[PDB]
């Protein structure tokens, strides 16, 4: 679309020892007003893949239904060949770029988290078709407020455990609530390991307002 209507904010994503964790608040904004407060911005592509999206929510639903039908078509053949996280990330990049070349982009910034063949995958795909992989991602306002914290922790501790990554992601959500005006205090947390995809929440962060008095 040319003008995004209902949009979601930043999406956090971090890789840990044996999986990837993705978090995103459940709020769809219409300008500066929080219209829909209970929508999911994270989806489960398949057993090893999960996707998070920020930006136009209507464009995310279209992509979610297209991707979903691709997985069903692939599972209908039953030939032992399933889409890997990198293949889903590749397909998305081509789809995002194709739409941007026709001057009718899908106003979305996606985060792809997966786990295949003992390797965790974390991909990023923006609306222009700019794609890359990293140990920790953050879209929208997360790049300026959450990325700095996530990067600082991955510089001393490149390999994190499930508990470390999960609690580090909750510290980022707390900061996002404090400084992002388009965010909500109710988020979801999806984790992908060898057992599959697990979507948790609706969770809340614990805020402190001791500075109001001082």
């Amino acid at each position: 679309t040319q003008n995004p209507m209902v949009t979601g904010t930043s999406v956090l994503g971090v890789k840990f020892d044996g999986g990837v964790v993705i978090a995103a608040d459940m709020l769809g904004s219409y300008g500066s007003l929080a219209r829909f407060r209970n929508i999911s911005r994270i989806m489960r592509v398949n057993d090893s893949t999960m996707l998070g999206a920020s930006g136009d929510y209507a464009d995310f639903q279209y992509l979610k239904q297209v991707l979903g039908q691709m997985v069903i078509d692939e599972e209908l053949l039953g030939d032992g060949h399933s889409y890997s996280p990198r293949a889903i990330h590749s397909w998305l990049t081509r789809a995002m770029y194709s739409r941007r070349s026709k001057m009718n982009p899908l106003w979305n910034t996606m985060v792809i988290g997966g786990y295949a063949d003992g390797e965790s995958f974390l991909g990023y795909v923006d609306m222009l078709g700019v794609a890359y992989e990293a140990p920790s991602l953050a879209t929208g306002y997360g790049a300026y407020l959450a990325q700095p914290l996530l990067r600082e922790v991955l510089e001393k501790q490149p390999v994190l455990s499930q508990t470390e990554a999960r609690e580090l992601v909750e510290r980022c959500m707390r900061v996002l609530y404090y400084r992002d005006a388009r965010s909500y205090n109710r988020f979801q947390i999806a984790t992908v390991t060898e057992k599959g995809v697990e979507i948790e929440g609706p969770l809340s962060a614990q805020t402190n307002w001791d500075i109001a008095h001082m």
């Binding site: 069903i72 078509d73 209908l76 039953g78």
Partner: protein
């Protein structure tokens, strides 16, 4: 020369080109479908025409959708193309209306697409019959069968192919209405073994598929254990 085209009626009001396509379905191996109290069971007597073929090659059972199964008989090339057509209808339906396509509507859509190839001389009628089976929590168990002309009816027990007239009799005996998918598997496995010709035909493999409450409304091939457990009881 009344039987050279599908857009030509014969003197006694018959479309011979459509009847010739049903003759090709009678040369195929027998495929049977049985709808029990909570699902449908498919069973084809896959004839292995070579020892060089891999166990599982030329399967006559497909997955048109997650909740829909398809047993075919006749031209494999034609049947595969019809399976693709059925996969599209089901896929398109979900994109448009937002939910799984009812089996009756899928049968209708595909049967009408099959009927379109029996009107002109520009094309030829499909030479393969197929059964569609699916299970839903609200819809229940459904089993349809579409022939070369485009006619599709609902069934309780069905058979198509070489010995479909002999396999039908051995299906009426069973009380599928009050039966169950787990018990029907063996019944269907035994029926396919009785009607299989061992004096004229060669060797064959048993293809079994089922959808129902036990598989949570999802169509899938009968597990090796169960498949071999029913294969021994039918022997």
């Amino acid at each position: 020369g009344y039987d050279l085209s599908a857009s030509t009626f014969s003197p006694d009001g018959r479309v011979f080109q459509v009847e010739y396509a049903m003759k090709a379905v009678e040369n195929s191996s027998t495929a049977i479908g049985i709808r029990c109290k909570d699902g449908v069971v498919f069973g084809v007597e896959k004839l292995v025409l070579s020892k060089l073929y891999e166990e599982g090659s030329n399967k006559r059972l497909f997955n048109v959708d997650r909740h829909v199964g398809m047993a075919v008989a006749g031209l494999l090339a034609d049947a595969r193309s019809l399976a693709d057509i059925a996969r599209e209808e089901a896929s398109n339906f979900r994109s448009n209306f937002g939910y799984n396509i009812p089996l009756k509507h899928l049968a209708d859509r595909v049967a009408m697409y099959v009927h379109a190839y029996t009107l002109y001389s520009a094309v030829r009628p499909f030479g393969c019959s197929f059964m569609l089976g699916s299970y839903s929590a609200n819809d229940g168990a459904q089993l349809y069968m579409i022939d070369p002309s485009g006619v599709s009816y609902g069934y309780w027990g069905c058979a198509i192919g070489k010995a479909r007239q002999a396999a039908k009799t051995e299906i009426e005996k069973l009380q599928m209405k009050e039966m169950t998918c787990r018990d029907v598997v063996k019944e269907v496995a035994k029926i396919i073994y009785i009607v299989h010709d061992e004096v004229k035909d060669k060797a064959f493999e048993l293809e079994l598929s089922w959808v129902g409450e036990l598989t949570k409304g999802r169509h899938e091939i009968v597990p090796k254990d169960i498949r071999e457990e029913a294969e021994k009881y039918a022997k």
